[PDB]
Design a protein around this ligand. Structure first.
Ligand code: NAG
Ligand code: NAG
Ligand code: NAG
Ligand code: NAG
Ligand code: NAG
Ligand code: NAG
Ligand code: NAG
Ligand code: NAG
Ligand code: NAG
Ligand code: NAG
Ligand code: NAG
Ligand code: NAG
Ligand code: CL
Ligand code: CL
Ligand code: CL
Ligand code: CL
Ligand code: CL
Ligand code: CL
Ligand code: CL
Ligand code: CL
Ligand code: CL
Ligand code: CL
Ligand code: CL
Ligand code: CL
Ligand code: CL
Ligand code: CL
Ligand code: CL
Ligand code: CL
Ligand code: CL
Ligand code: CL
Ligand code: CL
Ligand code: CL
Ligand code: CL
Ligand code: CL
Ligand code: CL
Ligand code: CL
Ligand code: CL
Ligand code: CL
Ligand code: CL
Ligand code: CL
Ligand code: CL
Ligand code: CL
Ligand code: CL
Ligand code: CL
Ligand code: CL
Ligand code: CL
Ligand code: CL
Ligand code: CL
Ligand code: CL
Ligand code: CL
Ligand code: CL
Ligand code: CL
Ligand code: CL
Ligand code: CL
Ligand code: CL
Ligand code: CL
Ligand code: CL
Ligand code: CL
Lengths: 308, 317, 315, 313
């Protein structure tokens, strides 16, 4: 019954404790235990200690974005077995989340972790979140997409990873994401997508890969994407020589929608859209042609053969 | 001995035919060997259990356009050779007992349109594994519960237009793996659950026009691999970020579709979603709640929760 | 109506019951309470069951009509009885025939007693749609055949009683559909042969009675689908212990379950020997029905109708 | 820092051990890195959600032989690395909230015996796909609801003896396809549904002794293809017509079984059913001494089907 001074409390449609943008630097004491939704966003809260909301057993929505979170205790969400939506975004100094923090939240549907200065995704961080549908991880400081990071997320439909520093997509980065509809990887440092990286993405409808470091994309990697409707590939250093031939053909047959695929090399094809190129425009190796054998091994197969 | 108000003959099937004779009840003395009985266009109001009990070989029963107020739950129990049952155009019938069709394993067509039906009780279509045509249009249905058609694995046609169905839950159409044509137009459909059409891999025609769809998840169309024709006009489509998945689906789809006219935002009013470019679909156009012409920036976080996810993303950043 | 019929006793516990057995009733009594869940009319002298004889008793689950004087059952006798679970029509020896559509629509029927009803045949469609049926009693009738697909809808049937009839053989598809059958009683008939693959659908069968019949041989291959077999009775059959008995002999050696004795009727040298206890070398040559008649003097038509090993013999 | 009543050490696993210290509450200050906690033999009465919340890596929790009156539904929610949970010998616990074990997808053993349990609530064992050992013996259970163990695809041992289970319904043991050992002795089991053991194809050992079975359908034993040892003694077996299916099964079964002593009729008292001949099983021995001929058709409805046949002849 006693509502905290910084807060407004009401009962319909859900029991709500709302205290946003009140300059709070700590979670207010005396939050009604029957709260189903708690809005603490836009304050200056620095920490989330253990069991900060433990009495609110019926909590389904916890809003904590745009604070000054520097640390979240691994036991911060004790008691919140029914939590469905958790927004922790826009806390640029958070940097790290203990890998066990979200454990046991089997009702979680939405998790906002964007703009949290996250340096890495720890092992087990998203384990057990079988009901999760939306995962926001964009605009962090991620430098890797480790294998099996999303392995338990069989119900995930939306995965937002744009605006990090992801250098590549390993084979099993997206293992287990059989329900994924939308995958956004634009504005990273992706220089390559491993073969079979999209093996589990039979339901994917939308894939953004623009503003990355791709010089090539084997058509074979796109072949599991049988539900694909929309593909974005612009602003990549595409090399339109022999290595572009598979992607070129795939683009000709694909009935969905796609962006331009502008050539960056060779110079004679600069600013040409690959989709509009004739097959005979794709010749030789672009990369100076005589190289070290170790460097020759690092080039596409058609370049190694073009030397011969 | 043929009833006075009737005409009886034996080929091609034993038939008792007495339509539009102003009959106040089912006539007595219908030949027990009857296979086809045409009693439509009369003034019959009840069908007790004993009415057709002697007609063991009955396969076709026509009772449409009568004055049916009631059908006994045991009216057809022993008549399991029944193949076609037309009970339509009896507007005051209002309700059919959920056990009325149990055991009719040879039934192929069931007409229940224009019967003022208020609801489909649990188990109404249970066990009808041979049913091919089901007419339920122009009734007073206000709900399409999960598993209503669970056993209709052989149904090819399902008519549901002209009711007041407000939404399609996830398992409303579970089990309909033979369905070819599904007509849901002229209802109040405001939303379709993303996996509502999971079993409709053979569906060729789908009507959803004249409803209340502000958006349709492209995900719900994805299982419709046999789809050839899709009707979507006369819905209040919102052509903002929420329309992006459907927009892409419409570009790739090789079958035929109606226009998808944008209702909001105003700058895109009467534009066709099919003809829009991706860049046209940016941001959020608030089409729900009180204070109806409103900017997303003016909405609390709590208010944003009722909007599409992509609207929430647009408002915050 | 709600008052109890004169010849009856009515009570509510445990189920609403109308009980009028052995009252000398010649017809179904009027005024049986519509709320009846159970009706006992056995041991009277009821001569027929006309259309809708109990149609108001919508909650009826048990209808007892055995040991009456039924000469006819109207095809629509059981109108209204959608919830009927146990129907006992047994011991009406002058009934002779049931209209093939009489039980149609009785989807809750679990038990059906039709034994000792003088039944001359099982009409096409007689047991159609009885998906819940578990017990079917057909013993001590006058059945002269088991037509194909007679039981094809009886997927939940566990007990089938057919003894004391005049069934002459078991055709290939007689028992199609009986995937749940546990006990099959076929004794005291005239079974001269069991068609190969006749037991194809009886993988759950635990008990098979074939004694007091006219079997001269049983291919071991016909028993092979019976993976659940526990008990097999085969006595009182004119078993012929020649070359034709070799497969059954081998089967009996390996069989881990229980079986009766299998007494040899021919040849005379092995008369009344138990096939189970014979050595394989005791099984030789071919003994035709018949002084023993040689294969050598037989017609080719007759020869073709003998077991394969007999045809091979003397050839 | 190790709590005064405890001993703490690192190898082989980080362990906090404080058993039999007369503790009335879970000690505060248990090291967060604890993988194993031994608090058995104390007098602990409550387990609030906060108790073990900081022990994120907790794998083994021993709480047996305490005074538990209550376990909070959120007591283990975040501790999803739990593999062994021993809550046994807390006779006043009586109820475990149906959500208590949700999300424990690494749980391998769960001890709930001697907890005075009155019921198993819906969803109590939901999602425990890793569970191998489940102890539920010596409680106060009066029913085994359908689908109680539906998700326990990896369960090998299930102990249910010493309860008051009156019957086994058709789908009580649905889902238990890895089950090796099932102990149901010392209950009140009067009947087992014919298809109750449908999913128990790997079952090797079945204890049904000290119950109230007057008969057991052979049909229920048929799917038990791996069965090796069956205990059936100390039941009031009726060796009349209703025993014929079990009689035959007993003749064919090549694993081991206890004696199956007849309780009725008097002429076969204390005889082993396994040793009887088929001719010894005839007619109906009515539980009362009442003749079969004297029985009304109404009364016969509550008897085995073969008794109805033996009565009417
Ligand atoms: C949660 O909701 C339930 C059901 O309305 C209620 O009984 C319970 O008291 C609530 N819990 C809290 C902590 O308010
Ligand atoms: C995932 O979504 C499906 C519906 O698509 C739902 O039935 C299921 O309960 C959800 N959760 C899990 C763990 O499958
Ligand atoms: C990736 O591309 C950016 C331009 O968008 C460039 O500045 C950067 O050096 C590239 N990095 C690598 C590793 O190629
Ligand atoms: C129904 O059809 C069967 C077979 O054609 C026939 O024997 C019977 O007389 C017909 N009529 C009735 C009322 O059963
Ligand atoms: C469905 O229809 C086909 C022919 O259209 C038929 O062969 C099949 O038996 C029907 N299925 C059922 C379950 O009756
Ligand atoms: C649906 O739209 C029609 C016209 O477009 C309107 O008359 C009706 O009120 C709407 N229904 C709902 C529930 O908003
Ligand atoms: C059958 O039982 C139902 C519910 O017990 C009752 O409402 C109904 O009146 C009964 N029918 C008759 C004919 O008594
Ligand atoms: C047949 O038996 C199965 C197994 O007990 C049961 O689930 C099913 O409901 C039964 N069928 C009918 C029609 O009663
Ligand atoms: C059937 O067996 C009996 C044995 O009592 C025998 O009398 C009868 O002739 C046999 N029937 C045939 C057709 O051989
Ligand atoms: C759990 O173990 C990991 C190492 O696997 C360690 O980094 C972490 O600090 C441990 N957690 C606690 C609360 O001790
Ligand atoms: C079940 O057991 C198998 C074999 O021991 C194992 O591979 C599997 O991981 C187990 N399941 C779980 C959920 O641990
Ligand atoms: C079996 O039931 C009887 C009374 O019905 C009871 O005395 C006996 O203790 C029961 N058996 C067991 C093992 O509890
Ligand atoms: Cl609440
Ligand atoms: Cl804010
Ligand atoms: Cl903290
Ligand atoms: Cl959500
Ligand atoms: Cl993104
Ligand atoms: Cl999408
Ligand atoms: Cl390729
Ligand atoms: Cl792009
Ligand atoms: Cl170009
Ligand atoms: Cl290449
Ligand atoms: Cl070359
Ligand atoms: Cl008309
Ligand atoms: Cl009128
Ligand atoms: Cl009526
Ligand atoms: Cl329609
Ligand atoms: Cl069509
Ligand atoms: Cl979608
Ligand atoms: Cl349209
Ligand atoms: Cl149009
Ligand atoms: Cl506008
Ligand atoms: Cl347009
Ligand atoms: Cl964003
Ligand atoms: Cl009698
Ligand atoms: Cl009659
Ligand atoms: Cl029999
Ligand atoms: Cl049996
Ligand atoms: Cl034959
Ligand atoms: Cl053979
Ligand atoms: Cl025998
Ligand atoms: Cl001889
Ligand atoms: Cl001998
Ligand atoms: Cl042969
Ligand atoms: Cl140590
Ligand atoms: Cl102890
Ligand atoms: Cl351990
Ligand atoms: Cl023990
Ligand atoms: Cl035990
Ligand atoms: Cl049995
Ligand atoms: Cl024992
Ligand atoms: Cl065995
Ligand atoms: Cl066995
Ligand atoms: Cl003995
Ligand atoms: Cl008894
Ligand atoms: Cl009696
Ligand atoms: Cl029995
Ligand atoms: Cl008998």
């Amino acid at each position: 019954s006693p509502c905290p001074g910084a807060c407004v409390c009401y009962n319909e449609p859900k029991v709500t404790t709302s205290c946003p943008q009140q300059g709070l630097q700590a979670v207010p004491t005396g939050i009604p235990a029957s709260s189903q939704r708690i809005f603490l966003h836009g304050n200056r809260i620095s920490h989330v200690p253990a069991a900060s909301f433990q009495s609110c057993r019926n909590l389904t929505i916890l809003w904590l974005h745009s604070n000054a979170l520097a640390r979240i205790d691994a036991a911060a969400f004790t008691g919140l077995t029914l939590l469905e939506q958790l927004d922790l975004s826009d806390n640029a100094q958070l940097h790290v989340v203990d890998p066990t923090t979200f454990h046991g939240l089997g009702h979680l549907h939405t998790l906002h972790l964007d703009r949290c200065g996250l340096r890495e995704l720890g092992p087990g961080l998203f384990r057990g979140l079988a009901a999760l549908q939306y995962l926001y991880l964009q605009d962090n400081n991620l430098q890797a997409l480790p294998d099996n990071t999303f392995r338990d997320l069989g119900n995930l439909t939306h995965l937002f990873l744009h605006g990090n520093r992801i250098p590549s997509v390993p084979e099993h980065a997206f293992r287990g994401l059989h329900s994924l509809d939308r995958l956004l990887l634009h504005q990273n440092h992706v220089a390559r997508v491993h073969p079979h990286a999209f093996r589990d993405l039979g339901r994917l409808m939308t894939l953004y890969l623009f503003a990355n470091n791709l010089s090539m994309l084997p058509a074979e990697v796109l072949m599991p994407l049988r539900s694909l409707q929309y593909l974005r590939l612009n602003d990549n250093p595409w090399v339109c020589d022999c290595r572009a031939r598979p992607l070129w053909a795939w683009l000709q047959k694909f009935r969905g929608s796609s962006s331009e695929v502008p050539c960056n090399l060779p110079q004679r094809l600069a600013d040409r859209d690959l989709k509009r190129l004739a097959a005979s425009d794709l010749e030789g190796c672009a990369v100076t042609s005589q190289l070290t054998d170790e460097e020759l091994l690092s080039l596409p197969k058609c370049c190694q053969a073009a030397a011969h």
